[PDB]
Design a protein around this ligand. Sequence first.
Ligand SMILES: *[C@@H]1O[C@H](CO)[C@@H](O[C@@H]2O[C@H](CO)[C@@H](O[C@@H]3O[C@H](CO)[C@@H](O)[C@H](O)[C@@H]3O)[C@H](O)[C@H]2NC(C)=O)[C@H](O)[C@H]1NC(C)=O
Ligand SMILES: *[C@@H]1O[C@H](CO)[C@@H](O[C@@H]2O[C@H](CO)[C@@H](O)[C@H](O)[C@H]2NC(C)=O)[C@H](O)[C@H]1NC(C)=O
Ligand SMILES: *[C@@H]1O[C@H](CO)[C@@H](O[C@@H]2O[C@H](CO)[C@@H](O)[C@H](O)[C@H]2NC(C)=O)[C@H](O)[C@H]1NC(C)=O
Ligand SMILES: *[C@@H]1O[C@H](CO)[C@@H](O[C@@H]2O[C@H](CO)[C@@H](O)[C@H](O)[C@H]2NC(C)=O)[C@H](O)[C@H]1NC(C)=O
Ligand SMILES: *[C@@H]1O[C@H](CO)[C@@H](O[C@@H]2O[C@H](CO)[C@@H](O)[C@H](O)[C@H]2NC(C)=O)[C@H](O)[C@H]1NC(C)=O
Ligand SMILES: *C(N)[C@@H]1CCCN1C(=O)[C@@H](N)Cc1ccc(I)cc1
Ligand SMILES: *C(N)[C@@H]1CCCN1C(=O)[C@@H](N)Cc1ccc(I)cc1
Ligand SMILES: *[C@@H]1O[C@H](CO)[C@@H](O)[C@H](O)[C@H]1NC(C)=O
Ligand SMILES: *[C@@H]1O[C@H](CO)[C@@H](O)[C@H](O)[C@H]1NC(C)=O
Ligand SMILES: *[C@@H]1O[C@H](CO)[C@@H](O)[C@H](O)[C@H]1NC(C)=O
Ligand SMILES: *[C@@H]1O[C@H](CO)[C@@H](O)[C@H](O)[C@H]1NC(C)=O
Ligand SMILES: *[C@@H]1O[C@H](CO)[C@@H](O)[C@H](O)[C@H]1NC(C)=O
Ligand SMILES: *[C@@H]1O[C@H](CO)[C@@H](O)[C@H](O)[C@H]1NC(C)=O
Ligand SMILES: *[C@@H]1O[C@H](CO)[C@@H](O)[C@H](O)[C@H]1NC(C)=O
Lengths: 728, 728
Amino acid sequence: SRRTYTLTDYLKSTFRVKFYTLQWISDHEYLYKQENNILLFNAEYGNSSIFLENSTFDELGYSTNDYSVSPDRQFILFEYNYVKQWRHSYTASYDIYDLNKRQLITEERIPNNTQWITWSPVGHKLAYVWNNDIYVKNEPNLSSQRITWTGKENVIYNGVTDWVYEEEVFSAYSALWWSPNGTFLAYAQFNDTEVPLIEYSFYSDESLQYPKTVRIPYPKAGAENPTVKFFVVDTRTLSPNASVTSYQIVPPASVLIGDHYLCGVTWVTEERISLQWIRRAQNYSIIDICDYDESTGRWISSVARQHIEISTTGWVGRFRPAEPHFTSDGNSFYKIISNEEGYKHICHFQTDKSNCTFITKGAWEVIGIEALTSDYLYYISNEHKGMPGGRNLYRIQLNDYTKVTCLSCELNPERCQYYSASFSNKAKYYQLRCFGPGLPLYTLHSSSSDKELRVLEDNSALDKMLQDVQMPSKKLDVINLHGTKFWYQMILPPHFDKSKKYPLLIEVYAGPCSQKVDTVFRLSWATYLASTENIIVASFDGRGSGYQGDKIMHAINRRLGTFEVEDQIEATRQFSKMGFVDDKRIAIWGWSYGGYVTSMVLGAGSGVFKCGIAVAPVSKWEYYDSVYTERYMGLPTPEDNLDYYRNSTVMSRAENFKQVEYLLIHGTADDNVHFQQSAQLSKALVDAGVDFQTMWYTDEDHGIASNMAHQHIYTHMSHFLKQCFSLP
Amino acid sequence: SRRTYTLTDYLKSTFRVKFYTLQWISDHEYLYKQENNILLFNAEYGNSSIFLENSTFDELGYSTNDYSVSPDRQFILFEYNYVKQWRHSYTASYDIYDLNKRQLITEERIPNNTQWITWSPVGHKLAYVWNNDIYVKNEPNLSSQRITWTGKENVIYNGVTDWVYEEEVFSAYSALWWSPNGTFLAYAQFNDTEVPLIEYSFYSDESLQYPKTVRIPYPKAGAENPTVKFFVVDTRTLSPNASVTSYQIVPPASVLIGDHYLCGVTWVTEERISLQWIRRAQNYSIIDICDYDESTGRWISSVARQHIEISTTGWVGRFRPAEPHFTSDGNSFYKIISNEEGYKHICHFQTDKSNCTFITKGAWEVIGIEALTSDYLYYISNEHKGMPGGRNLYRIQLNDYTKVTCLSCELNPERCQYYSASFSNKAKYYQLRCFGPGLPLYTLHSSSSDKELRVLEDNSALDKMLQDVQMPSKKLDVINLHGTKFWYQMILPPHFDKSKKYPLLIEVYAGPCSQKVDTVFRLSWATYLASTENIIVASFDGRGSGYQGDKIMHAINRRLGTFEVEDQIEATRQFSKMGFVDDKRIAIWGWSYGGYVTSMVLGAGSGVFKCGIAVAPVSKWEYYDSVYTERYMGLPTPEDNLDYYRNSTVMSRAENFKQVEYLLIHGTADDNVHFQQSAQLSKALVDAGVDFQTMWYTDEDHGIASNMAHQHIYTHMSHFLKQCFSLP
Ligand SMILES: *[C@@H]1O[C@H](CO)[C@@H](O[C@@H]2O[C@H](CO)[C@@H](O[C@@H]3O[C@H](CO)[C@@H](O)[C@H](O)[C@@H]3O)[C@H](O)[C@H]2NC(C)=O)[C@H](O)[C@H]1NC(C)=O
Ligand SMILES: *[C@@H]1O[C@H](CO)[C@@H](O[C@@H]2O[C@H](CO)[C@@H](O)[C@H](O)[C@H]2NC(C)=O)[C@H](O)[C@H]1NC(C)=O
Ligand SMILES: *[C@@H]1O[C@H](CO)[C@@H](O[C@@H]2O[C@H](CO)[C@@H](O)[C@H](O)[C@H]2NC(C)=O)[C@H](O)[C@H]1NC(C)=O
Ligand SMILES: *[C@@H]1O[C@H](CO)[C@@H](O[C@@H]2O[C@H](CO)[C@@H](O)[C@H](O)[C@H]2NC(C)=O)[C@H](O)[C@H]1NC(C)=O
Ligand SMILES: *[C@@H]1O[C@H](CO)[C@@H](O[C@@H]2O[C@H](CO)[C@@H](O)[C@H](O)[C@H]2NC(C)=O)[C@H](O)[C@H]1NC(C)=O
Ligand SMILES: *C(N)[C@@H]1CCCN1C(=O)[C@@H](N)Cc1ccc(I)cc1
Ligand SMILES: *C(N)[C@@H]1CCCN1C(=O)[C@@H](N)Cc1ccc(I)cc1
Ligand SMILES: *[C@@H]1O[C@H](CO)[C@@H](O)[C@H](O)[C@H]1NC(C)=O
Ligand SMILES: *[C@@H]1O[C@H](CO)[C@@H](O)[C@H](O)[C@H]1NC(C)=O
Ligand SMILES: *[C@@H]1O[C@H](CO)[C@@H](O)[C@H](O)[C@H]1NC(C)=O
Ligand SMILES: *[C@@H]1O[C@H](CO)[C@@H](O)[C@H](O)[C@H]1NC(C)=O
Ligand SMILES: *[C@@H]1O[C@H](CO)[C@@H](O)[C@H](O)[C@H]1NC(C)=O
Ligand SMILES: *[C@@H]1O[C@H](CO)[C@@H](O)[C@H](O)[C@H]1NC(C)=O
Ligand SMILES: *[C@@H]1O[C@H](CO)[C@@H](O)[C@H](O)[C@H]1NC(C)=O
């Protein structure tokens, strides 16, 4: 009877998955925009009430908003006219609306193309970056004070990151931080003067007669990296006829020595800030906790307050060293690190002592610290049921590491095994976000009573919608490789036959510290491949993956393209041992690093895979950026690791592609994995006499994210997989 | 029984078609390279002597790619270190060899990276371009003397064409012209200052960490074109401590009025030069025969000596206006222009009388004037058998235009219907080149008795091989469209069997004045397609084609992408309704203009074609260069032809692509038809939700001619074709 999940279902998001985004604005109240009106919900009394109606969002372009209400609740910031740039970065326009007089501020408006804006932590101060320079507004109707005058396109960024810092270090565009009471505003300046430029054509609209050339300061492996400086402005003296009072905090000697990176900024107190630096190698990190000298206005550093974290078996942290979470008095902090066993656990440090005390242990890892009060610490880990692909919220008593309780494990054990949490201030309440394995579920809770104050979103609407369709099922199991058990998952077609034979599709990412296998509910292209095309879609996290301890994650240090690729084969090999797999029809695919591994596996000449598809794949690590590549492969010089760079390019394996049907896809405007990568790859194959297929996407970036492109690629990839599989 | 001409035979040229390349150097002697020796033959006598032993090459420390002997037979130029640029342009290194003392002149050498070099018509002077400047060397062993100082990269070219003059007007990279006795040295200077730059990426070898951005001053439709200046230099006063004596010849005012092009330079005598200019709108052209004034050094022009040529139905010439052929004395010249009946024939002009007299007439055309003596004039036309796709050599008596003799018609009426010739210095002898339909045949003839002195090359070898292989047959014929007789050709598969239904592939170019239907013998991809895959390959010349009169050719003036594509469809539709054609399997493919035409047809929704391949297609004329585009479309403004520009793009037909299988190939380093053109086309298709196949070629250009690429694209297109035709 009932239907199957169709490609059109997937491409037209006909089966919507709802979520519940809120914005805490006190230890017990939060804002939520419904339809278009911001409502203020009180978590302590359960009552709510419109904060400002739908009738104030005057569309000044096309669509609108995202909002930000000043901590003092006297003003509200409205963003619209959003112009996307890189992954996190973009420009937009802002309008400040007075919540008192209840009028839109027209005098001293915020510039068109602001790159970043933000309220001070308290009161209603503003600090924004426009044309790479920092400006501050003590009042929404006053004139801003220019803080920096060095701003310069493609060269000097003040308050916002350059391309590589946005992407591989901060995972954000923002590079300014207000101090708790708004006394100080800290920021970072990036200098790209010596950073080479990546360049590519961007054809624009059909009517543009000459293509334009995009130029971006992008450091590829080995290249000259951008430098950085850090400053702390004392906003108290900001006046139109006064000078900007500031101080430059320089990194510690152990780091100044050579090329380094600024990777973390944490305000401990108004008089204390914490900076986290890392040498360019990324196996030596350090935390420098600076104190404000009242009598001189300078932030003094101290050996007693510095904390070195290093890695002798790989790199520090997962994707970057863990951030420290300071206590209120700032005299001590907690930060995740690797223990003697190689597992990521919480360690307790005292601001001025170098030895710490782990407050957790186990054959599991703390995913990240979430909230900290004077009595408890709330964190996320994959301990529960020993599944590295699960996430639960836990609370541990600071005065007895014995009293640890799981606050989410048994709320809905079958439907919910993957949470993320969002606490209020002082952490007296929290939103629980459940992403699977069952339909997503958002609920609010009290921290004291641990009770479920209410259901914010249950997706019951999607539940109905789905009971009428033949959904596939997702199973997570285990196989052993090298005496170790690695997890895998398979999306199984509806009424999963049994011993009958189905074509297999490995969906791989496998980048370092990644995790493709999990209990997150997803409605993806695989869902359709299984439900409608009856294709099994497996995934496997072998060596290099994360969340299972450094032993597994650092297996690929300095040798990407080896184990993670090899394990994808060994596992698919076993998958074919199983009787429901049609070994004559096994394919593989992946995007980005998944594109790389897809290609490397297809280039292995293992005889196991029939066809593959790589999308925006890395092909030669020397083409990728410094921060990411150098973290796992070191420098591409003969005195360092140039050898493993050389033998891990996809081109080196071109002759074997003759044994498989290959589909290579890239977006011509990929600022991330430059189209260049695929250009050098197809050339090698051409030189090698290998037939394959191609698909370029004019002006699409790393995401091939436009609607038309999105639908095109999957439709195009679908026909390919079906052809290779002899499917109608 | 016998094998078939296989795809591999075509790609690796297993079957070589020999030819014979000689260089005349007198009226009875020509140079010929044999087994790497330069031999000097003697016409009539037939004997030959070693002019330079191949042992001379081996002593040189490099691969001598080309040679040139001084007209006085004392020196020989050795071209090596060749480095191709555009279609004609390229730089090289040169060594001058002293034939008398048999040494390699090693002092005051020619610089490396020479853009162009050439001997004076007599003696052994040299003129060369280097760094966009002109240098003159009187003696091989003496310092050269600089002539221009303005030469600047991508902006000022002295003695060599810029991108657009090379490709569109001169079909050459040289812009130098020695006078008959080498007294003067005429040269054009090109200013690209205000011409926009086309920018694209060149990836180069894998080791290149960052791609290189290529930039060419390239004028696209309606854009600022480069400007030009002509100059005659009196080399006699050339001395290190002396300025340069030069006069700038400006075009007649009727042309100077606005944007113009210099499209011809012909020396008549040592004191008379003929320049040919054209207006940006190529429907007005004028010849200005200038005389040297000994008392001033000026080159004076006179209204009497000016001949205006214009078209009311299209543009002047076939691609450019025919060039004037002057008489020894210089008082009269012969040039091809259009009849009052629209047919291109030879008109006799008086150097100072505005009227001329047509010495030839009919419903056929003269392709070109080959030689001119004081009694006879030799030309090539397609009159024989009223076959527009044929070529023969004719001789006409200047004293009586009634006696015309066809020198090639009856030499091999069955094997040779397409010739081209080469005459000795005074036309005392001529080499006839027979390119089809039989195997190419080169022969030597004496202008006196017109008897065949000997067979230079008959390809007897090739003839022996092919008899042992099932070669397909090529039949030319006619059909009627719009009440006219348009020619076509079909490469029929071996042992053709009317009654049985073959798949049909239409190979099309269709560019204005083009000719796909001819009698030239060609070992092509179609040969393989028909001999092996049993697919019929046909070509059709409809409206817009050339060599059939202006009424046919100018039909698409100002409306490119209409009648000619419309004529391809009507024609196929007829072939479709024939018996031996399986209308359920008809494809069409093409390159450049052909690619554009293939696309416009596929997107016409005429339902005739199943699939199509487009290689480096034009997609929107505003993207192509001005000289060529503006010649058939005029200017892309609302006051001109902007409207036919607008509805002639391929994008505007993107939707109809939902009805056909389409392959889109394009070199990413195509400087001629920019990649942008396909980039824009795919984007349109993707935005129209249409699925198609793509294939980019890293760094290949318009010809996609590297040996590896060349093979890949034909193997690729072969697969695609076989799929679509349901062929195993
Ligand atoms: C430099 O030039 C000399 C010519 O003086 C080249 O010698 C030629 O070498 C070829 C190959 O060994 C000879 O070809 C032979 O021709 C006979 C016909 O008489 C044929 O039966 C054989 O099958 C073979 O093809 C050729 O006779 C000989 N010189 C002549 C008479 O043309 C020499 O090869 C050249 N050196 C190089 C490497 O360029
Ligand atoms: C690059 O070369 C290294 C060195 O040979 C390869 O490492 C070896 O791989 C083989 C086959 O998988 C193993 O049996 C050896 O034990 C490895 N030796 C060492 C020293 O590690 C590596 O696999 C190659 N990597 C790529 C990208 O092909
Ligand atoms: C090439 O053409 C440019 C104009 O496109 C010439 O530049 C002009 O030079 C004159 C005198 O040097 C100035 O008065 C003008 O202002 C310039 N025009 C512009 C807009 O640049 C240039 O001189 C030409 N080059 C040569 C050597 O002929
Ligand atoms: C020579 O070509 C020009 C350039 O196209 C002709 O003039 C244009 O004619 C079209 C219509 O045919 C008009 O739409 C344009 O506005 C005209 N532009 C100009 C500058 O006149 C011109 O008529 C042709 N000369 C002749 C009469 O043969
Ligand atoms: C561009 O638009 C013009 C105007 O409609 C088209 O010209 C006419 O096309 C129809 C269809 O062939 C004919 O019946 C008319 O005789 C054409 N002539 C004119 C002047 O109207 C033209 O075909 C379109 N070109 C393209 C490439 O689509
Ligand atoms: C594709 N996955 C591509 C090539 C490997 C690295 N790639 C990225 O896009 C990364 N920048 C992803 C990423 C982002 C942020 C962090 I911290 C870590 C990885
Ligand atoms: C493809 N054939 C492309 C688009 C039409 C013009 N094209 C060219 O490549 C031409 N530049 C070829 C050409 C060159 C010189 C003359 I005179 C005429 C045509
Ligand atoms: C909720 O109701 C209480 C009264 O018990 C009131 O003090 C408060 O203002 C209300 N808060 C909201 C969010 O409406
Ligand atoms: C504004 O909110 C109301 C609900 O109170 C809703 O009915 C209306 O459609 C919304 N208009 C929009 C889309 O801004
Ligand atoms: C940026 O760095 C360059 C050195 O590469 C230096 O000359 C310049 O002063 C720096 N700019 C700033 C504002 O720090
Ligand atoms: C700041 O200086 C400007 C002119 O330099 C002056 O108009 C203004 O009054 C000064 N600010 C104050 C309030 O002193
Ligand atoms: C950190 O990495 C560098 C660069 O690869 C290496 O030379 C250095 O010895 C490492 N330090 C360690 C492992 O402590
Ligand atoms: C042909 O050329 C040779 C020199 O290679 C010469 O000896 C001979 O006399 C010439 N033949 C005649 C008789 O003209
Ligand atoms: C000019 O010629 C004279 C000959 O008298 C020579 O001595 C002088 O060096 C020359 N000057 C140059 C190098 O232009």
